[PDB]
Each structure stands twice: as C-alpha cells, then as structure tokens.
Amino acid sequence: LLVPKLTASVTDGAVGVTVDAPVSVTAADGVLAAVTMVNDNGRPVAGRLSPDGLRWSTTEQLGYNRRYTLNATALGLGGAATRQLTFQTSSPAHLTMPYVMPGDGEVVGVGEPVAIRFDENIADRGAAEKAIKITTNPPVEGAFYWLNNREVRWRPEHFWKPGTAVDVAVNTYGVDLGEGMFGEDNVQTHFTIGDEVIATADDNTKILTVRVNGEVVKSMPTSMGKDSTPTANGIYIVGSRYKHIIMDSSTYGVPVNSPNGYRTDVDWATQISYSGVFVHSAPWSVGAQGHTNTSHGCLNVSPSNAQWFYDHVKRGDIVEVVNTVGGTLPGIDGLGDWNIPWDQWRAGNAK
Ligand SMILES: [Cl-]
C-alpha cells in the first residue's frame, strides 16, 4: 500500500553544494536497493549503504567545482521508487591552508595557546571559528581571539593545568571562509601540557628565577633592556629555541646602523616575544648581570645559564617580567596572549 519515499541531502539542480559533509540518500516506507553517484567525467564515487538498507552516504572526499549525478532506487510493499539528481559543488575563487601549532604529539608548557594560522586573509572569521573544534581533558573553558587577519588563537582563562590533553580539529575543507575563499584541506593535531614552569625576571633584583611546580630550581643574574630601550613588563610565552642565532634588529624594523640597531651572533637563545626579546648567552655583560641593564630588550644571562634555560625550558612555558621602567608587552605581539584581559579575550573579535 505504501510507496517508498527518497530523501537526499541535496536537491536536483542545486549549485554551490558544499563539500564539508558527505552526500546522503535516505529511504522511507521501504529500503534502498541501490545507489550510484558519478562525477562529470563518468567516474564512480565511493559510497556505502547502511546495514539496515535505509541510508546511503558518500565515503570519499568530494571535489570542488564538480558536477555529480545521483541515482537511487528503493523497494516497498507498495512498489518501487526511483529518482535521479544532478548538482554542482562549490567553485572557490581561492584556497587557503591552515597551519596549526603546537606540533602533533608535542608536550608544551602551561601557557601554550592553540594557534591556527591561515596563509590568506580570512574574511569570515565566524566561519573559521565554527570549523575549529577544540577538545580538552579535563575539560576547561576557552575562547578564540584573532591576532591579525590570518592567525587565530584559542586559550583558557588561566594557565593550563598540567596533564591536560588537548585535541584540535581544523575542518575547513569545503567551508566558505568568505569572498570565495575555501579551505584547501583539514588538519588534526594533539598535544599535552607538561610541568608548570614559570620564570620571573624582577628588575628590582635583576634576577631571573625559574620555578618548576612551585619549586625554585635556578636563579640567574640578568641584564635586561637599558632605560632607553627597556624590557617591557608582562607575561611572555616561550616560543622557539636556538643553539645559535644571529639577532638582527632590521627584522623588527630597526636599521642595523641606526642608533638602536644591532646585529649579534649569540648562543643558546630562547625566544619569548615576536618583538625580538630572547633569553640568551651574553659573555660580554656578565659583570652587569644582576646589577645594571645594558641590552636593547633581551634577557642577557651567563653562557651556562643560557644553556640551562635552553635545556630545561620548553615551548609554552612562561616568563613574567616585572618592575621594569618599560611598558607592558602587547597582547597581540605573537607571544603576549596572556596580557589580554579575559573579558576582552572571551568577547573575541570575529566581527
Ligand atoms: Cl575525474
């Protein structure tokens, strides 16, 4: 008596079908006998019928700018039912690829934010945020905030609890990110939070003290930025580490041969700001370390102490600078995320 009815996730003649989800067909008042899908060059598209015969779905990634033809047939006590559908998928103007930090499988400090950097400007930040799923164990609240037009960050209100597992899924393939920009591919990554490592550089004492889970493990005399080019106060996130690097002021916009310029080859350099602040070996300022500031901003320490820092501090650990004559590190520096107040971070800037 009842005839089968066929329902698809697309309609005949549709355009702009997005490829961020499989295409599916479902039968009612009956079961699907067979479903086929082919592309505009005639090639079959891989699919699977559910065991109960009621639901069919594509099983392989669908492509941008293709035309697909779907043919389904179902059987019921009333009789048979058949339909054909043709539709076209999104045709992007541009592609953008996301790049996620930290690396897959890494162990990082309690200050490490999730970073998703696209290689193009993102017109629809809301769509980007919606395609990124952050899972945490233990679960903890967090929020997105854009540092510039290409890079978005995600972090909780306070530093991570040690031992937290973090899973990141950037599912932008098939997502319209605005102005015809679509994701080139998806990215999946996982990382773990390690020990709590907080080094405090106190200008009042000119000592850099490293505390691991509350325990003082190292005290390093330091020479920070001189009065005319002081080290900014605030919370710094540890980034990359270098056995040696040539610090070049022109990288930060200051000509080398200008009054505040510098080019210096140094050892055991740990970067803590995009603005150019490093902890590094400074044999020339050992006597000043612990007494007077002499740098253009870097935390100068002894060779042995700089190497200790390199060996025992990891990406995402924290350096806090206090009591300098400087201002405060900008929240959008690149490693200054924690200087943005939570109320402002949580409200976000997706526009
Ligand atoms: Cl083909």
Side-chain angles (χ1 to χ4, degrees), residues 62-76 78-85:
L62 302 172
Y64 294 120
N65 203 25
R66 304 305 303 273
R67 188 172 56 257
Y68 294 98
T69 301
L70 190 58
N71 285 99
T73 296
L75 300 184
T82 308
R83 55 188 297 204
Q84 176 174 302
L85 299 84

Side-chain angles (χ1 to χ4, degrees), residues 15 19 22 26 33 45 61 94 102 111 167 210 241 244-245 300 307 311 317 340 350:
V15 301
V19 292
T26 304
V45 172
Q61 181 172 282
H94 276 287
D167 202 80
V210 184
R241 298 135 74 263
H244 59 92
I245 191 177
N300 287 4
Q307 185 172 2
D311 292 335
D317 288 346
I340 294 182

